[PDB]
């Protein structure tokens, strides 16, 4: 039963490349999936991939004996500054498993307990900013979520204070990061990226990579000159030994990991919190239930590690926000050997797949007719959810190493937000999703009314 898979419209020798000539390429691809179904071929000059959107097919793609992580074009471009750090290394590069072994302990239960106080430090700064707004001032949500999440990974991970809440403009790191991600996204559709027309793009890209590396150098210099004793992510990077190869990370790889963790360790968590607050103000019944939990659990001025673990409904809110808008919205795979997908689509060794996560998460055969509805209760029983229906953290040994960090931070912060404020969608905000490879609301604003509960 070998089927022929559909393909969206082509542009002569450019094949499908011009379909990416948009500021919202993931959302365009979602619309193509709407039209063509669970699988479609997508070609560019010298490259073919296949976009998967159904749990039926993605559950086979998640078989690690058959498929391994692939670097999408996006990740090949990001590798220009993230190197063979964990996010952009191939599974078979020595430095992937070596850094995985060395850094996995930085996300253990013990490590998360050790991060908790510094997470609260930043969370309290967010709450204080909002308590100090004047009447009818509003909150710029993605902007403040980025302040929070960048500062949290900087402090917990590296004992470095970006002091984002002391700035009315983004930290220089954020400015250059966003511009670098923008460039990587825009470069996806460039048929002739070496045309001199993109000389300025190349210069600006290089300049943004230098800004990011300059900050890395300071983080490293400050640590090695410090007299204080840290036991954080940077400590493991500088001192941890791979049980297997016996070696620590070398200096070049450490720099890549710092860049990787500064970016991966906050950008998608800012998106998550922004989407979560959006869905909460758009669903006041859900907001109330989550606020009720926050009030019952967060009985002290400062939340404790144990209390955040009891914010179980807030946890389902965040999972439901990751279902509708997973902020790292795709990952890529290649076939390890010849194999047949779904009994219908033969693949040769090396053939590429793209997993289109927001479309997977809209599979009506999994979630039912009400798929566009925000209902955190869908997550009450993970055993009732079919395998590989829900993949916001990737797959297998290449799944997100920072998942627990992200969810603890987001649960803590959303819990405090709901404990301390009522929220008003005073503009009846129309969801507008900005793409920077990752996804985040743009222009989302709210008003907060303080419950006047002291910290």
Ligand X SMILES: CCCCCCCN1CCC[C@H]1C(=O)N[C@@H](Cc1ccccc1)C(=O)O
Among candidate residues 189, 187, 181, the one with its CA nearest the CA of residue 42: 189
Please give the span between the terminal C-alpha atoms of the chain, in angstroms, as a whole number: 64
Q: What's the farthest any 2 CA atoms get from each other in the chain?
A: 68
Q: Which does 120 bind (CB under 5 to 8 A by kind): ligand HEM, ligand C=Cc1ccccc1, ligand X, none?
A: none
- The length of the chain in residues reads 455
The span of 81-89, 218-226, 387-395, 420-428 binding ligand C=Cc1ccccc1 (CB under 6 A) equals 81-89
Residues annotated in the binding site for (9Z)-hexadecenoate, as ranges? 51
47 binds ligand X (CB under 6 A): yes
- Please state whether 264 falls in left (phi above 0), alpha (psi between -120 and 50) or beta: alpha
d(CA 101, CA 94): 11
Q: Is 307 in contact with 342 (CB distance < 8 Å)? A: no
Short-list 398, 389, 392, CA closest to 57: 389
Enumerate residues 6+ apart whose C-beta is below 8 A from 147: 126, 164, 165, 167
Binding of ligand X by 42 (CB under 6 A): yes
- Give the nearest distance from C-beta 264 to ligand C=Cc1ccccc1 in angstroms: 4
Question: Which entry of ligand HEM, ligand X, ligand C=Cc1ccccc1, none binds 267, CB below 5 to 8 A by partner kind?
Answer: ligand C=Cc1ccccc1
Least separation, in Å, of the C-beta of 162 and ligand HEM? 15
User: 88 is in the binding site of which of ligand X, ligand C=Cc1ccccc1, ligand HEM, none (Cβ under 5 to 8 A by kind)?
Assistant: ligand C=Cc1ccccc1
- Nearest residue (CB) to ligand C=Cc1ccccc1, 181 versus 233: 181
> Does residue 260 touch ligand C=Cc1ccccc1 according to CB under 6 A?
yes
Nearer to ligand C=Cc1ccccc1, 233 or 328 (CB): 328
Listed in sequence order, the residues at least 6 apart from 11 whose beta carbon sits closer than 8 Å to its beta carbon are 17, 18
27 binds ligand X (CB under 6 A): no
Q: What are phi and psi of 31, to 5 degrees?
A: -70, -35
Q: Applying CB under 6 A, which residues contact ligand HEM?
A: 69, 86-87, 100, 153, 260-261, 264-265, 268-269, 272, 326-328, 331, 392-394, 398, 400-402, 405-406
**Binding-site sequence positions for heme:** 400
312-331 residues in contact with ligand C=Cc1ccccc1 (CB under 6 A) are 328
Query: Nearest Cα to 337, choosing from 45, 39, 21, 65?
Result: 65
Whole-angstrom Cα distance, residue 279 to residue 299?
25
- Choose from ligand HEM, ligand X, ligand C=Cc1ccccc1, none: what does 440 bind? Cβ within 5-8 Å by kind: none
Q: Which residues of this chain interact with ligand C=Cc1ccccc1, rule CB under 6 A?
A: 78, 82, 87-88, 181, 260, 263-264, 267-268, 328, 437-438
């Amino acid at each position: 039963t070998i089927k022929e898979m559909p393909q969206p419209k082509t542009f002569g020798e450019l094949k499908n490349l011009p379909l990416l000539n948009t500021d919202k390429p993931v959302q365009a691809l979602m619309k193509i999936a709407d039209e063509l179904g669970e699988i479609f071929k997508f070609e560019a000059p010298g490259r073919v991939t296949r976009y998967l959107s159904s749990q039926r097919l993605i559950k086979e793609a998640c078989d690690e004996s058959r498929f391994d992580k692939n670097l999408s074009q996006a990740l090949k471009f990001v590798r220009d500054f993230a190197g063979d750090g964990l996010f952009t290394s191939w599974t078979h590069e020595k430095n992937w498993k070596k850094a995985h072994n060395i850094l996995l302990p930085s996300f253990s239960q013990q490590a998360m307990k050790g991060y908790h106080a510094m997470m609260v430090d930043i969370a309290v700064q967010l709450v204080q900013k909002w308590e100090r707004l004047n009447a009818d001032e509003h909150i710029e949500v993605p902007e403040d979520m980025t302040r929070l999440t960048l500062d949290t990974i900087g402090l917990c991970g590296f004992n470095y204070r970006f002091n984002s809440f002391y700035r009315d403009q983004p930290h220089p790191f954020i400015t250059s990061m966003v511009r670098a991600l923008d460039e990587a996204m825009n470069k996806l559709q460039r048929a002739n990226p070496d045309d001199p027309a993109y000389d300025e793009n190349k210069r600006q890209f290089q300049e943004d990579i230098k800004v990011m590396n300059d900050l890395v150098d300071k983080i490293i210099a400050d640590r090695k000159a410090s007299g204080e004793q840290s036991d954080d992510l940077l400590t493991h990077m500088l001192n941890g030994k791979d049980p297997e190869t016996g070696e620590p990370l070398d200096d070049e790889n450490i720099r890549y990991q710092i860049i990787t963790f500064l970016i991966a360790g906050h950008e998608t968590t800012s998106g998550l919190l922004s989407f979560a607050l959006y869905f909460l103000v758009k669903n006041p019944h859900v907001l109330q239930k989550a606020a009720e939990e926050a009030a019952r659990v967060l009985v002290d001025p400062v939340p404790s590690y144990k209390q955040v673990k009891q914010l179980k409904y807030v946890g389902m809110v965040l999972n439901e926000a990751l279902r509708l808008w997973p902020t790292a919205p795709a990952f890529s795979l290649y076939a390890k050997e010849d194999t047949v997908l779904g009994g219908e689509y033969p693949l040769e060794k090396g053939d590429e797949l793209m997993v289109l996560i927001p479309q997977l998460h809209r599979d009506k055969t999994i979630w039912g007719d009400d798929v566009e509805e925000f209902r955190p209760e869908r997550f009450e029983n993970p055993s009732a959810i079919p395998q590989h229906a829900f993949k916001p953290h990737g797959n297998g040994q290449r799944a997100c190493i920072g998942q627990q960090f992200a969810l603890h931070e987001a649960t803590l912060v959303l819990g405090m937000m709901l404990k301390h404020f009522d929220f008003e969608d005073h503009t009846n905000y129309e969801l507008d999703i900005k793409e920077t490879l990752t996804l985040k609301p743009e222009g989302f604003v709210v008003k907060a009314k303080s419950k006047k509960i002291p910290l």
